[PDB]
């Protein structure tokens, strides 16, 4: 019976959350793609610094 923190919480749309995303499984397969962008960009502009201007 209510004897605790008097809080109220946001997941309260009677239309789905699920219309709005709920997953994050990319980021181990995303961190790899980005690293391929840097590792191909770095070799493209050969001598100039790889950390931009």
């Amino acid at each position: 019976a209510p004897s605790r923190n008097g809080m109220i919480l946001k997941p309260h749309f009677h239309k789905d959350w699920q219309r709005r995303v709920a997953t994050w499984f990319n980021q181990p397969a995303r961190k790899i793609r980005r690293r391929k962008a840097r590792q191909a960009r770095a070799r493209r502009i050969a001598p100039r610094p790889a950390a931009g201007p």
């Binding site: 019976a1 209510p2 004897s3 605790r4 008097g6 109220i8």
Partner: protein, 147 residues
């Protein structure tokens, strides 16, 4: 781990919690904080004493950055410096007094609390306090502002 839950030991019981004299239904007595002013009054008046009403003086675009002012007590005022520093009283060209920044460590106000070892100091910080300025003086050191 569903093999530790109590529902796994609650098979065979005709209701397994929530009884049978009143089979507690989908939601009796409002969803969420319903009532709370006229039929949950008793719970709201002895576990959240002040909940309905307001105290005025609104601020409209509160930028909490301009009110940043963390405080460091005098007890842990020698923690901001190394150990070669504090130990030296008349050693290693630490003469009458060393210097302690506080704006560097991240804190601005110097609040007074606790004894401070008897060594002359120059506490530099953007603010101060009356006791915290008295105690530093009483040790032999000086209070210096900076901005």
């Amino acid at each position: 781990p569903s093999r530790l839950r109590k529902t796994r030991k609650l098979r065979g019981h005709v209701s397994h919690g929530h009884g049978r004299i009143g089979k507690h239904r989908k939601h009796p007595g409002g969803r969420g904080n319903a009532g709370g002013m006229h039929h949950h009054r008793i719970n709201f008046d002895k576990y959240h004493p002040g909940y309905f009403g307001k105290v005025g003086m609104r601020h409209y675009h509160l930028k909490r950055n301009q009110s940043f002012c963390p405080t460091v007590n005098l007890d842990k005022l020698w923690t901001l410096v190394s150990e070669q520093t504090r130990v030296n009283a008349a050693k290693n060209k630490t003469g009458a007094a060393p210097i302690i920044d506080v704006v560097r460590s991240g804190y601005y106000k110097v609040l007074g609390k606790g004894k401070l070892p008897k060594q002359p100091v120059i506490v530099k910080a953007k603010f101060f306090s009356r006791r915290a300025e008295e105690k530093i003086k009483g040790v032999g050191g000086a209070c210096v502002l900076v901005a």
